[PDB]
Amino acid sequence: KWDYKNKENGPHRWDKLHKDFEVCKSGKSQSPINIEHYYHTDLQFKYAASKPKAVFFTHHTLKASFEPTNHINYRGHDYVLDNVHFHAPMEFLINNKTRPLSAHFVHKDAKGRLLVLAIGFEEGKENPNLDPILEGQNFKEVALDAFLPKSINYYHFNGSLTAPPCTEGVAWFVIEEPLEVSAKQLAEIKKRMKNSPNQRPVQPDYNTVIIKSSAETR
Amino acid sequence: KWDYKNKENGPHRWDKLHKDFEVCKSGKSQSPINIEHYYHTQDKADLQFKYAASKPKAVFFTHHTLKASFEPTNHINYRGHDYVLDNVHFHAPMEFLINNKTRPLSAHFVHKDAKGRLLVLAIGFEEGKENPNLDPILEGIQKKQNFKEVALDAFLPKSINYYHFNGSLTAPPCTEGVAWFVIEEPLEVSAKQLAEIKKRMKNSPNQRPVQPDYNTVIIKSSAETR
Numbered sequence: 001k002w003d004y005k006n007k008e009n010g011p012h013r014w015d016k017l018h019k020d021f022e023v024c025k026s027g028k029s030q031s032p033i034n035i036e037h038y039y040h041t042d043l044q045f046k047y048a049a050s051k052p053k054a055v056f057f058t059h060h061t062l063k064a065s066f067e068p069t070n071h072i073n074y075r076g077h078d079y080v081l082d083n084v085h086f087h088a089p090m091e092f093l094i095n096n097k098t099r100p101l102s103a104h105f106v107h108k109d110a111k112g113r114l115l116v117l118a119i120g121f122e123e124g125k126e127n128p129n130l131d132p133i134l135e136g137q138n139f140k141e142v143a144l145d146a147f148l149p150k151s152i153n154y155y156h157f158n159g160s161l162t163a164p165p166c167t168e169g170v171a172w173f174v175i176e177e178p179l180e181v182s183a184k185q186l187a188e189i190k191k192r193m194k195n196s197p198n199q200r201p202v203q204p205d206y207n208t209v210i211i212k213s214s215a216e217t218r
Numbered sequence: 219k220w221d222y223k224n225k226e227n228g229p230h231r232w233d234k235l236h237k238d239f240e241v242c243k244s245g246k247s248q249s250p251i252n253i254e255h256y257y258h259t260q261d262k263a264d265l266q267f268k269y270a271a272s273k274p275k276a277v278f279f280t281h282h283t284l285k286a287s288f289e290p291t292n293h294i295n296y297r298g299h300d301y302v303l304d305n306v307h308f309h310a311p312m313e314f315l316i317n318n319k320t321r322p323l324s325a326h327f328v329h330k331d332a333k334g335r336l337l338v339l340a341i342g343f344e345e346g347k348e349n350p351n352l353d354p355i356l357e358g359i360q361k362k363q364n365f366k367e368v369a370l371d372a373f374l375p376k377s378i379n380y381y382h383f384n385g386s387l388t389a390p391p392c393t394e395g396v397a398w399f400v401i402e403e404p405l406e407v408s409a410k411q412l413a414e415i416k417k418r419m420k421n422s423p424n425q426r427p428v429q430p431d432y433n434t435v436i437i438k439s440s441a442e443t444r
């Protein structure tokens with residue numbers, strides 16, 4: 001049972017717990033990393049009001065799953081949202097800028113490739129998109145179509161899962177725009193993960209090629 | 219033992235030659251691939267060249283290809299990370315595909331920083347004219363010791379467009395984490411130059427078949443070598 005704690009099952013010792021998990025140690029394109037040097041420079045969305053198929057804290061974090069009806073298109077391939085989960089703190093560093101929460105929209109295409117999306121949260125206003133996840137027969141829909149800023153700066157690169165098995169072949173898009181969140185929610189969420197911090201330390205970057213581009217979500 | 223003949227030694231089947239080659243099949247950032255989707259960008263003046271025409275420490279054929287070794291007097295500085303040209307070896311045909319474009323030959327400029335980091339600099343060859351940079355090489359297989367010079371600063375183009383991404387070495391152990399600069403511009407090679415090296419590789423095609431892409435982020439940009 002791998003964990004994020006400072007002991008033996010910790011992030012630094014993940015490869016020597018299971019053997020599929022060597023990649024947490026042997027990989028060169030491991031996520032997360034500190035994004036500070038990048039190059040400035042085809043994304044489509046099928047996000048809609050969706051009922052989470054399930055909501056739960058799992059494998060050390062809180063997570064919401066989804067019916068395979070909501071998609072993202074990249075390179076002419078629909079990737080399917082399974083779930084979106086949370087990390088506190090934010091796993092990814094943006095030019096040494098830190099946020100108290102991020103969220104990962106995890107997707108998969110027909111070939112098999114994963115495409116995940118990360119965005120930051122800054123402390124602030126009460127964020128109404130969070131309640132149906134915090135609320136987990138008659139499941140209330142979640143506003144996937146209203147979650148992200150209409151205008152978004154993203155960073156895109158090739159990386160890894162940030163929790164075991166640290167599988168590679170993941171397309172990372174990380175948004176520079178933060179989603180504001182009131183502090184009562186943050187405290188409430190940090191504790192739905194057992195007041196235990198689920199952030200992987202920055203992994204080695206061996207000059208990951210990153211693009212900065214922009215898009216309109218809706 | 220590993221070769222391109224689709225027997226026991228075939229190229230995807232590399233993982234089963236050494237278990238050192240497991241990344242050759244299990245790897246996610248594997249080269250070569252079709253350079254067909256990419257990002258147009260600028261020049262932050264990142265990659266710089268202080269190359270010079272230099273005499274090889276040794277010339278020899280190795281591991282299904284021709285290769286030349288070099289003194290650490292020649293370096294590449296990039297983003298504050300200096301690499302040493304270690305050697306130059308060849309592939310016919312070219313392994314990386316440029317917009318689905320096929321070249322009859324490549325050459326790989328291998329670089330190394332103090333670390334384990336790799337930097338390969340690849341450029342193509344098409345049928346045609348005599349390659350004056352190559353002319354000093356086919357005479358280089360007839361000799362040891364004082365090998366004939368390579369006009370290496372006269373090898374590459376004065377002005378250069380490349381494609382850049384993180385990939386792997388293209389031959390076993392198929393090591394990933396290799397910074398690829400792939401040049402679209404071809405150098406020319408005579409059919410005489412074309413035919414003779416293929417026999418120094420036994421007319422045996424030494425190209426790793428195209429690997430799966432996991433949405434590899436590639437940028438297209440340009441620079442000056444000379």
Ligand SMILES: Cn1nc(S(N)(=O)=O)s/c1=N\S(=O)(=O)c1ccc(C(C)(C)C)cc1
Pocket residue numbers: 082083104106108114116160161162163164165
């Ligand atoms: C363990 N892990 N880490 C992640 S991160 N933080 O890099 O986005 S996602 C994850 N596991 S997961 O989201 O439940 C998941 C992993 C793999 C799949 C498939 C589609 C089977 C490849 C589907 C869901």
Ligand SMILES: Cn1nc(S(N)(=O)=O)s/c1=N\S(=O)(=O)c1ccc(C(C)(C)C)cc1
Pocket residue numbers: 304305307326328330334336338386387388389390391392
């Ligand atoms: C295995 N291999 N693959 C290559 S390709 N086709 O991706 O450019 S070059 C190669 N082997 S090699 O050029 O002799 C070599 C030279 C130097 C090193 C280091 C260990 C970095 C000094 C490692 C391998």
Ligand SMILES: [Zn+2]
Pocket residue numbers: 085086087103104162
């Ligand atoms: Zn995550």
Ligand SMILES: [Zn+2]
Pocket residue numbers: 307308309326388389
């Ligand atoms: Zn090569």
